[PDB]
Nucleic acid binder design. Sequence first.
DNA 1: TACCCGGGATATCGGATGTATATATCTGACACGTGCCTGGAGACTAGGGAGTAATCCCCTTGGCGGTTAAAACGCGGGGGACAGCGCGTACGTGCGTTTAAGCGGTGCTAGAGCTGTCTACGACCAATTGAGCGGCCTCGGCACCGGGATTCTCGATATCCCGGGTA
DNA 2: TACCCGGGATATCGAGAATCCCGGTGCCGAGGCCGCTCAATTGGTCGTAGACAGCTCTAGCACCGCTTAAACGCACGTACGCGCTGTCCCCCGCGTTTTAACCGCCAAGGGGATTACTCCCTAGTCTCCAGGCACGTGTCAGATATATACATCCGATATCCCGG
Lengths: 95, 95, 99, 96, 79, 79, 104, 105
Amino acid sequence: KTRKESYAIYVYKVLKQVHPDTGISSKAMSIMNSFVNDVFERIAGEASRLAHYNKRSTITSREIQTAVRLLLPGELAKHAVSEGTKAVTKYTSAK
Amino acid sequence: KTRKESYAIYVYKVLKQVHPDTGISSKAMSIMNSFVNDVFERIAGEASRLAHYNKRSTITSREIQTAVRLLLPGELAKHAVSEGTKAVTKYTSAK
Amino acid sequence: KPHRYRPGTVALREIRRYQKSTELLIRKLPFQRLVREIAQDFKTDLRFQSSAVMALQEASEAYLVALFEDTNLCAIHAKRVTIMPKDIQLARRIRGERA
Amino acid sequence: PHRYRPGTVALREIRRYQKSTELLIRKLPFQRLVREIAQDFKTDLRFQSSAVMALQEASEAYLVALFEDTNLCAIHAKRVTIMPKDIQLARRIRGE
Amino acid sequence: DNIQGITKPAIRRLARRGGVKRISGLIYEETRGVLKVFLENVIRDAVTYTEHAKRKTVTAMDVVYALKRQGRTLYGFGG
Amino acid sequence: DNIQGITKPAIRRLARRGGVKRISGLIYEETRGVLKVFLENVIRDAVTYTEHAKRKTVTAMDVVYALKRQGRTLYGFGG
Amino acid sequence: AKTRSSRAGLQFPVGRVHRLLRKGNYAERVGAGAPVYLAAVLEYLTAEILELAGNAARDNKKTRIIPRHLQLAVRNDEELNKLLGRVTIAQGGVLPNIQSVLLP
Amino acid sequence: KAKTRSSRAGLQFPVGRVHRLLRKGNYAERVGAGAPVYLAAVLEYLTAEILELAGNAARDNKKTRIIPRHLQLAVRNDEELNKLLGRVTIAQGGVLPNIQSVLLP
DNA sequence: TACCCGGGATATCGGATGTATATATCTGACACGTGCCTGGAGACTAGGGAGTAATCCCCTTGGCGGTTAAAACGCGGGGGACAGCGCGTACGTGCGTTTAAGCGGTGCTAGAGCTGTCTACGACCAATTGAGCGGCCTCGGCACCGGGATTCTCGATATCCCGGGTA
DNA sequence: TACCCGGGATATCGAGAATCCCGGTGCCGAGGCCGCTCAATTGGTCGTAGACAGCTCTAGCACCGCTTAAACGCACGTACGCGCTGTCCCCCGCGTTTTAACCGCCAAGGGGATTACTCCCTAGTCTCCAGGCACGTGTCAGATATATACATCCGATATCCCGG
């Protein structure tokens, strides 16, 4: 009865925000959960490697930004860096 | 003038212990140094992954043993696990 | 007369039929027996979750379908339409799976 | 006027270059190509000599493995002549 | 010995999914060989992970970790 | 434009190292294309590492890290 | 008690991402811009893929995304195929691809 | 009473440097003592095997100094070292003398 | 040896088969509400990792003179890639036979999966010292020039045995 | 017709260009010695990570009965693989001419790296509380039976065309 964490409700929230009438099965939810875990591990891995290369011990937004620019191919990198920088501005200038 | 660490003298010691008359150039020494760093990173990586899978935070000899049994192909694994277990016995029963 | 198609028409019909479906093509139980038999030669008295054998079958079928894709490209490359074990061996060699 | 048949100097060169270890691409035009390609990523980039040497080592190793797979495709097609068909097949089967 | 359970129609269906129109007769044994080698590599790694967990049941996570180590990441079974 | 500096004899020598006996004429442009794409991928990554180090000189370690990320580990240049 | 997800205008949890960056043994120190930025990136990739998958579900006249729809959504896009080239999606099958030389 | 753990374990590669690289490298929170001894042993064994085959190929080439080419031949003519280093380029090494059969007259 | 009829390649429509599109039913899996509790959040403090200024000297880039190995440009030819042809054999399709893979049940029990206890093993801190790295040096193993042995290539030449028109 | 003439293919040798081996000479990088400094070691102390015992209850494995779905085998025929052969054109060897790659030497300055100093961002503690998860319940999306339409695709055939 140990609570197994998941990204299921967050994927469902983003699905309703991009397609309000389409639902999703549980197998496709498992596939999306594994996609999120995979991309997470990929980006955090590359960021840790970047921090070790530069003799640093702090993973900041710059490491995640360069990890995204390495790992995502082309236009996905361009849009995600924009979206990420937007969210950090809104974070650093909020109330 | 920062002392750059290396495995050069240790490779030279093992070379004299396996071929007493053959020397080695500096480029082949660089290649052996990079081989040692590479295999080190490979085994410590797999061992860290094993420890994370099993909800553990201590890398012991068992993790390194299973990392060697995963990464080395076949007979290299069989001889290295033997050699490694030998060195841990001699370590745990020394003065 | 009994009706019969020419060679090739049912093959292409089946190509379409199986490229539309997503279901597992190997039967479940003989594959399970093969998996337990191969495991036997590593440790005696091993047990398996059902999802473990389903995962093995999913990956095995995906692997063989990508392999036959590359084998068909080798056959077509040799101005043939019949795949041969030469073609599988070439595919696996260039893909790096020989050793 | 001595003249060999076609094929004999080719095989002689195959042996000569499979025994040698030296770099086959000239150094300076490769360096200009590397600076030219880098130019389209950041202006005013500098390069250590060992960086360009590493690029050349890896590029030549890549092209030699590519021609090995291309020769296997040619032999598979009952030919002794490599073709752009063969390079494209090699890169396709290799996943590039 | 159970490798024959991978029948000729099943290999033909797999080839149809790959888009193959015509299949020679020596394919089938060759394919049984290749599949046998693939499962050998994968199950060995999965059994190793079971050995390290001091368990007797090979979980699906073991097979996922094994396929992932070999560069064939499988989605839909956890992890 | 400097891609022609990769000459026809140099591609022939590379093919000889690969064991190729006979070379058709359309190979050479195709090979110039493939090499151009390879260096594009590698130098992009190396420049990214230089960007992150806030430097202006692309070191050999950058190219080693880049080739290693792309699954082509190069020995003999450090690291 | 305003959560950091809503403070950043996001949906993915910034707290869970932050504690997975801490527990995962990646570095000694982990900033605050890092989990916010990483949750933003992950939300963008999930958004793009679920968009293409809902489109492929619509083309198939269905309102529930199945594995097959994710398969088509990924393999018909070029950059998601480059991203997930070494990834098998279960219950997905392949694209309807028939070579030209096999046709009569 | 300053006997090092390398000599204590009967090894040559430094157990202290391996231990401090397992600590600095951010692999886990805790690191035992059996781990760096065992890992130094494994690394010593692989270095021994590679330098053995490489001295053999240097001797066969009538040379007393191991060059990169000799490491190349030592690795690519052994099967298991080829499996270990299949995706690894050794600089200044070249390739094996391999000529296909159909190309021969 | 002329009329009639047999074989072959390439358009046409009937007609047989599989396939995409219309309803009815029934489900069981997805969507949603509820309790609750454990991880997220707010507040505060310490310190040490990181930002910034200054310095300095390494090494990266640019330029010139020569010289020489290599690339570029064309000849001529054979040999290999490309279109045409025939055989045979071995696969694909369809029909009857039959082997076993799935579905639905219960029974059991080995073993995964949690809980509490508790010591021993590792992190942290200080002293100390010796092992490992920068610098220097010298000298012998490797690089290199030249000559002879050798080692495969290729043409010229004598010789040969099977069938279409010359003398 | 049997001729002496004439095109295909075989062995055999000897010039001839290329390569390996063998000495002979120089040179520069690898092996070795010395200072010193900083990281490996030893001794000590807590704190909690993990080994271990016990309990449970989940699911994994053996066992039977029907049930058709699918595998197996056999005949047959035709379409594709493969061997043969004829052409031609394209690439390969080689000589000649151009040309830019390399060496080497020197010069100026951009920035890589190092040290010092401040400062502020995160790790860590403590307290509180509410969002996420397990569990329960409905309801409709779609999987499943059957019924006609709507494309291929193969043979009879419709006619063109020579031929034995």
